[PDB]
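Page 37, continued from 36.
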């Protein structure tokens, strides 16, 4: 009952109220049958100048009357001819309700489809897609901008973007809507390559929009960089923008951004460039603009719950079990030091000149030099204290009573925690002190080789008592890290039975 190929035909509703229900149409069911009878798309779609219309048996919608005749004459005509041939067929001319069906045809499994970097690269890498306007580059086969001089579309070198950047839910001006744009360009090419029997893309509705079909697409794990002329190192500045006089100026040190490293770890460009490839400050000025619906630069970069912001995406990262043990327990400090991981001094510039705009009109190559400098000048990772310098096992028995004191495997766990982190660079860079990792459990005191006892703040005598403090911390981390043994229900694996 789940289908991804449903079309609810309701085109004449634009001309006025419909007398009868819209007509449900299974496109994949129809192309399969048409193929089997030796026909193709041309059975139902006309073309004009080598471009196939996506409309049924027409190039324009001229009137309600004309449209009704096109549907009835052509839809029913085929059904009738198949009937007298004694073949499987659809509703006959007199079965009004069988097409004009008030009850839904099937359920919809339809899913949107898009290019992650793997799929985009599988297209870039295809021999079947030939270079355009270049000895090697493939880009012009798919990407365009409108050239006002020639009054036509041309490949705009290094101005390639997702189709969504210029094609919307509805056709604005002579830019078609996204669905028309994609259905036209994508499927047309797929059908051409299919003729050469070189590997190609889907033509069936289900082939693109069915979750089952999507799961089957070959994925490439190591995907080459998609180079469109973007910086390796970006310099993000508190851009005020022309509007709002006086306008807000920045108050922090500037931020250098390793754009190249982030590409390698992200799954596309759009994740961050959510409207179009450009700066962020084009819309998210310090004060915000109408074009950002007044979302300010600060929000764009710090929004804790958005995948688009520095802090937000990093926040999803720390929800990994290897991180979540500590990160589901600790509270951010918002200390100057932590802010300083991103906001750093620029070489040769003072604070007064940066939030004066001294950097705003520098050439891309020059700001890259400045940014790369800021990136390389960041101190080397201090790592963690030598684990041999902390107790290997601590006895937790301050409140022993019903059980024996816990013999806590202190050093072994810390070692596992560092192992679990591995070469994660987000962990390496933001864990700025030798004892930062220690604070994942020893919270609310400075990073140190010698943190105070929990009892110094808990249940001695807001805050939990000492037993609650232990249980919540121990059991909590194990749940978040998916630690199987010990089980939280195993009441003796952390503190052995009284006597017995
Ligand atoms: C499937 C093969 C059809 C059969 C059998 C009948 N109709 Fe139909 N009709 C069909 C389509 C694809 C459309 C367009 C639907 C839309 O809303 O765009 C139509 C259109 C009409 C209309 C005009 C639109 C409306 O007012 O709802 C009418 C009045 C109409 N159809 C009538 C009608 C009757 C009475 C039929 C039995 C004699 C009949 N239809 C059969 C598809 C099919
Ligand atoms: C007649 C039985 C059809 C055959 C064979 C093919 N298509 Fe079709 N298509 C048909 C209809 C009735 C419609 C709805 C438009 C209308 O004027 O009522 C369509 C629509 C499409 C679409 C758009 C889908 C959507 O956006 O909802 C596409 C992209 C499309 N069709 C492609 C297509 C191709 C490539 C075909 C051969 C493989 C083909 N169609 C055959 C009817 C029929
Ligand atoms: C031959 C070129 C056809 C044209 C043009 C249209 N249809 Fe059709 N239809 C055709 C066949 C051979 C079948 C049966 C397919 C099968 O495998 O059973 C059908 C069936 C339908 C149905 C019934 C769907 C179902 O519930 O099983 C409907 C409602 C239907 N057809 C609608 C329809 C409309 C509205 C068309 C114009 C847009 C149309 N069809 C054209 C063959 C052909
Ligand atoms: C803005 C930079 C655009 C991006 C990114 C994409 N498209 Fe586009 N497209 C754009 C304009 C200004 C127009 C209208 C041209 C005119 O004559 O005024 C278009 C048009 C199309 C069309 C229609 C013409 C045709 O090819 O038959 C298609 C099919 C189309 N666009 C597809 C398309 C796809 C698939 C894109 C992502 C790969 C894409 N466009 C991006 C502007 C822009
Ligand atoms: C030529 C100019 C194409 C355009 C435009 C689009 N696609 Fe494509 N596609 C093309 C080829 C040559 C191939 C084969 C690549 C290979 O592996 O050799 C493909 C393949 C796909 C696939 C993968 C199918 C599978 O793995 O089974 C999909 C899902 C796909 N294509 C989708 C797609 C979409 C949605 C497009 C516009 C947004 C699009 N393609 C354009 C060639 C061309
Ligand atoms: C992969 C090459 C496609 C094939 C084959 C078909 N569709 Fe498609 N469709 C495709 C894209 C890339 C898009 C744009 C949005 C997206 O999914 O990325 C669409 C869009 C639609 C829509 C419009 C959804 C909306 O937001 O209004 C529908 C309902 C739709 N597509 C239907 C459809 C049908 C019925 C097809 C067979 C005729 C079909 N599509 C094929 C990509 C591809
Ligand atoms: C990297 C993950 C960030 C951390 C950690 C913090 N900030 Fe940030 N901030 C970041 C970016 C990418 C930007 C835009 C570039 C710029 O420097 O303007 C910002 C911007 C601000 C702003 C607005 C601009 C300004 O007033 O100068 C403020 C007020 C700001 N940042 C404050 C701030 C503080 C107090 C932080 C620690 C709690 C902090 N930031 C962390 C990136 C990152
Ligand atoms: C047609 C088969 C393509 C070729 C060849 C190239 N691109 Fe592409 N690109 C294509 C599509 C359909 C899309 C949008 C996919 C979506 O789901 O939105 C794109 C997108 C881009 C982007 C934006 C990345 C993103 O986050 O979506 C860029 C920067 C881009 N394309 C660049 C690019 C370049 C430089 C290419 C030649 C090396 C190139 N593209 C080829 C389809 C196709
Ligand atoms: C978030 C992790 C990003 C990913 C993934 C990609 N980009 Fe990016 N980009 C990002 C930021 C924060 C910035 C700085 C913008 C600012 O306001 O300073 C950028 C900048 C660019 C630029 C430079 C534009 C300019 O300075 O005029 C380009 C051209 C660019 N980005 C392109 C791009 C492409 C094509 C990507 C996929 C291959 C891509 N970016 C990913 C953040 C992120
Ligand atoms: C104008 C074309 C914009 C550019 C360039 C960037 N953004 Fe944006 N952004 C814009 C709008 C219209 C909105 C509000 C509507 C919306 O899409 O949410 C936003 C919003 C954000 C947000 C907030 C998300 C949330 O959940 O609250 C963030 C964090 C954000 N944008 C980030 C961001 C970044 C990092 C960009 C450069 C890569 C960027 N934006 C550019 C408009 C525009
Ligand atoms: C997911 C969409 C991310 C967004 C948006 C941003 N970051 Fe990021 N960050 C992310 C990962 C998965 C990584 C590891 C890959 C890497 O680039 O090393 C990181 C790491 C950092 C680091 C440490 C390493 C480095 O590249 O310098 C810093 C200092 C950093 N991130 C900064 C940063 C800023 C300032 C961003 C907003 C402009 C930002 N990140 C976005 C994932 C994602
Ligand atoms: C306990 C041993 C830790 C583990 C395991 C991980 N992190 Fe961590 N991290 C920890 C502390 C005590 C702090 C200091 C918080 C403060 O505000 O002073 C941090 C901080 C970070 C940050 C900075 C932003 C923040 O969330 O406060 C990041 C981005 C970060 N850590 C990332 C991170 C990742 C990706 C980890 C798993 C690979 C990870 N951390 C583990 C303690 C501990
Ligand atoms: C390790 C992950 C634990 C599990 C599982 C359980 N407990 Fe626990 N508990 C733990 C610690 C580190 C401590 C402190 C030890 C001390 O004596 O200081 C405790 C403490 C208690 C106490 C209070 C002390 C006492 O009366 O002996 C009780 C009564 C207690 N815990 C009960 C208990 C039960 C019934 C459990 C099974 C559900 C259980 N704990 C599991 C660590 C861990
Ligand atoms: C959670 C998994 C821990 C991490 C990460 C680190 N330590 Fe820890 N330590 C932890 C507990 C539950 C206790 C018991 C404290 C109590 O009050 O019962 C301890 C204790 C210490 C002590 C002894 C304190 C005292 O008894 O007065 C020291 C000196 C100590 N731990 C140091 C330490 C350091 C420096 C770490 C980072 C390398 C570190 N711990 C990590 C839990 C956890």
């Amino acid at each position: 009952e789940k289908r991804a190929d449903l079309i609810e035909i309701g085109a004449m509703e634009r001309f006025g109220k419909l007398d009868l229900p819209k007509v449900a149409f299974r496109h994949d069911q129809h192309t399969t049958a048409v193929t089997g009878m030796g026909k193709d798309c041309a059975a139902c779609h006309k073309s004009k100048d080598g471009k196939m219309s996506l409309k049924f048996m027409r190039l324009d919608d001229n009137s309600a009357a004309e449209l009704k005749e096109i549907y009835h004459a052509n839809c029913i005509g085929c059904h009738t001819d198949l009937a007298k041939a004694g073949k499987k067929t659809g509703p006959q001319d007199g079965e009004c309700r069988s097409c004009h069906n008030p009850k839904p045809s099937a359920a919809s499994s339809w899913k949107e489809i898009g290019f992650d970097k793997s799929l985009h690269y599988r297209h870039v890498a295809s021999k079947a897609i030939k270079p355009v306007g270049d000895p090697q580059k493939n880009c012009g086969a798919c990407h365009h901008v409108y050239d006002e001089a020639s009054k036509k579309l041309v490949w705009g070198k290094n101005k390639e973007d997702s189709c969504r950047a210029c094609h919307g839910e509805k056709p604005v001006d002579k830019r078609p809507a996204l669905d028309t744009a994609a259905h036209t360009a994508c499927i047309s090419c797929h059908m051409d390559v299919a003729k050469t029997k070189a590997e190609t893309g889907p033509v069936n509705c289900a082939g693109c929009h069915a979750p089952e079909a999507q799961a089957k697409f070959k994925v490439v794990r190591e995907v080459p960089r998609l180079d469109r002329g973007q910086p390796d190192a970006a310099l993000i500045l508190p851009v005020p923008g022309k509007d709002a006089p006086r306008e807000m100026k920045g108050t922090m040190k500037p931020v250098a951004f390793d754009h190249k490293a982030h590409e390698a770890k992200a799954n596309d460009c759009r994740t961050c460039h959510h409207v179009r490839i450009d700066t962020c400050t084009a819309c998210h000025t310090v004060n915000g603009t109408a074009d950002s619906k007044f979302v300010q630069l600060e929000k764009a970069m710090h929004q804790p719950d958005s995948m688009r912001s520095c802090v937000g995406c990093h926040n999803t990262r720390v929800q990994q079990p290897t991180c979540a043990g500590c990160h589901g327990f600790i509270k951010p400090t918002k200390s100057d030091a932590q802010c300083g991981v991103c906001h750093v001094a620029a070489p040769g510039f003072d604070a007064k000149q940066v939030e004066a705009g001294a950097l705003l009109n520098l050439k891309a190559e020059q700001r890259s030099q400045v940014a790369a400098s800021m990136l390389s000048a960041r101190p080397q990772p201090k790592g963690t204290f030598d684990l041999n310098d902390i107790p290997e096992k601590v006895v937790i028995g301050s409140i022993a009573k019903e059980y024996q004191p816990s013999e806590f495997p202190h050093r072994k766990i810390v070692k596992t925690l560092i192992a679990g982190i591995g070469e994660d660079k987000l962990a390496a860079t933001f864990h700025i002190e030798k004892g930062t990792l220690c604070q994942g459990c020893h919270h609310n005191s400075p990073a140190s080789l010698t943190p105070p006892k929990c009892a110094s703040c808990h249940g001695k005598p807001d805050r939990p008592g000492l037993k609650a403090a232990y249980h919540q911390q121990c059991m909590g981390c194990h749940d978040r890290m998916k630690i199987e043994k010990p089980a939280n229900t195993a009441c003796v694996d952390c503190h052995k039975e009284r006597a017995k």
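Residues 47 and 53 are 5 Å apart (CA to CA). Flag for discussion at group meeting. The longest strand covers residues 6-9.
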